[PDB]
Amino acid sequence: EKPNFLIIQCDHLTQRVVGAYGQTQGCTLPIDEVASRGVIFSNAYVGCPLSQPSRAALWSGMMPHQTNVRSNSSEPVNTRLPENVPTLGSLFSESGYEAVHFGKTHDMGSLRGFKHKEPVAKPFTDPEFPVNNDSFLDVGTCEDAVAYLSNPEPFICIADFQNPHNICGFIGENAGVHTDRPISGPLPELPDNFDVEDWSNIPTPVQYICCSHRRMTQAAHWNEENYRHYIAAFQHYTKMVSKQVDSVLKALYSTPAGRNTIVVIMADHGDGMASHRMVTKHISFYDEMTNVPFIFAGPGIKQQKKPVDHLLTQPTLDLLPTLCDLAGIAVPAEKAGISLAPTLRGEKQKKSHPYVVSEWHSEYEYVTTPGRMVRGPRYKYTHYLEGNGEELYDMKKDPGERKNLAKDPKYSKILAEHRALLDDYITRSKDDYRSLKVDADPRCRNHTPGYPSHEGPGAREIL
């Protein structure tokens, strides 16, 4: 019998908060239970740390400059994926699967082939944290997926949850200098990489996220207590969505279809979680935002106690071929992803990514400051057109990315070697990166570098 698939994706969800990754306890027990039956990938980099580019890319198995959906802007700034591009939904539908999608779309046409049902917001009251339509829509999504799974073959079902994206609304309610609303639970500690060591040693676009990113403008002058309350809220919205994941899985396993279902849990991108002073996602490529949870379990998938760290994976590219392989569906040769089904099955992985990549372009076209990330087996390299800025982090010895090695002459060979990987990427993927124009108004680079120095309203008000 062909397997069913349930893909659960949570917007902003991070490795740090998912207990299976070993950093934070107590926030994701239902996800951790799935992980404990299957396989989790340590190195799972998304193609862009932003929702619409990530999703347009994910469901088509392509990179953002190829879909040409490079920001969150709507039509005509970004155009829907052409109907001739194969997608996860087209491939599965054409192979006899019922393909259904619940929850957040934000796909710019890459969900073609799925039958989508729009969720309806179901409001509720939270006595300690701000909640908004992000959280209320998730209630509807959960109801929809529960109803579907409680009476389902073969099928592929996506449940696209918003949380912990309600962190964005939290930041708005706590913008600027403020005293935090008291909460009852423990107040988390700041991460080891909270502080930026040296602002002069990071790229211009990253130095001025306070100017270009509304949420960073709002948090720029936050104190340490303020950031700790941010982390608490992030954990709270994570717990909230984890309860919905539990409800969805209970529905799945309530009929005989469940045991024949492969479950995937992932995120479109992560969240700064105060690391590098960052809130949410914008411009930078640090692991908190680019390296997401990527968990599989189900029939034929052999349990692995240890996270898989010997492979570099790219969910944005790899999900489509992995699911097709598990379903016995031929993948178009042009798709650049690499099926992980052999690793999942305990069979020989004959092909793997030598490196993985992420992209930045713009958020809403106020500031266009393209960049690229290359994660090799050990080091992460970043480049930004603006100022020709570069980063180089030793991910083995400096997993917090505190120490930029790009200007250290001891690392000049390593730096060259990673520039060369970017060159290979640009060639093979037909990236127009090197020809792109920076549009970064000097008004958004007009104070001493770094967020504590930020003055004034930021790009969306000034430009």
Would you tell me which residues interact with Zn ion (CB under 5 A)? Answer: 210-211, 454
**Residue 382 Cβ vs Zn ion, minimum distance, rounded to whole Å:** 20
Task: Provide φ and ψ at 249, rounded to 5°.
Answer: -65, -35
Q: Which two tokens stand for residue 351?
A: 């092909």
Q: Which of 38, 52, 2 is nearest to 323 (CA)?
A: 2
**106 annotated to bind ligand:** no
Among residues 281 and 418, whose Cβ is nearest to Zn ion? 281
Nearer to Zn ion, 210 or 295 (CB): 210
**Least distance to Zn ion, CB of residue 170, Å:** 21
CB of 136 to Zn ion, least distance (A): 32
DSSP 222-251: --HHHHHHHHHHHHHHHHHHHHHHHHHHHH
Closest CA to 11 of 62, 60, 46: 46
Count the Cβ atoms, other than its own, within 10 Å of residue 224: 11
Q: Report the amino acid identity of residue 72.
A: N
Q: 117 or 447: whose CB is closer to Zn ion?
A: 447
**Residue 211 labeled ligand binder:** yes
Least distance to Zn ion, CB of residue 446, Å: 8
To Zn ion, the closest distance from the beta carbon of 445 in angstroms equals 8
Phi/psi region, residue 296 (left: phi>0; alpha: psi -120 to 50; beta: rest), is beta
> Both tokens of residue 154?
């073969």
In the complex with Zn ion, the residue whose CB is nearer, 377 or 452, is 452
Minimum gap (Å) between residue 285 Cβ and Zn ion: 19
What's CA 387's distance to the chain center, in Å?
A: 26
Kindly tell me which of 218 and 261 has the beta carbon lying closer to Zn ion: 218
Residue 106 Rama label (left phi>0; alpha psi -120 to 50; beta): left
Length of the chain: 463
Q: Is 10 among the annotated ligand-binding positions?
A: no
- Closer residue to Zn ion, CB minimum distance, 210 or 273: 210
Please classify residue 44 by burial: count the beta carbons closer than 10 Å to its beta carbon, then call 0-12 exposed, 13-18 middle and 19+ buried. Answer: buried
- Looking at the Cβ atoms of 144 and 386, the one nearer to Zn ion is 386
Least distance to Zn ion, CB of residue 202, Å? 14
268-277 exposure pattern, b = at least 16 Cβ within 10 A, e = fewer: bbbbbbbbbb
**Is 324 within any annotated ligand binding site?**
no
Neighbours of 359 (CB within 10 A): 27
Residues that constitute the known binding site: 210-211, 447, 454
Residues that constitute the known binding site for Zn(2+): 210-211, 447, 454
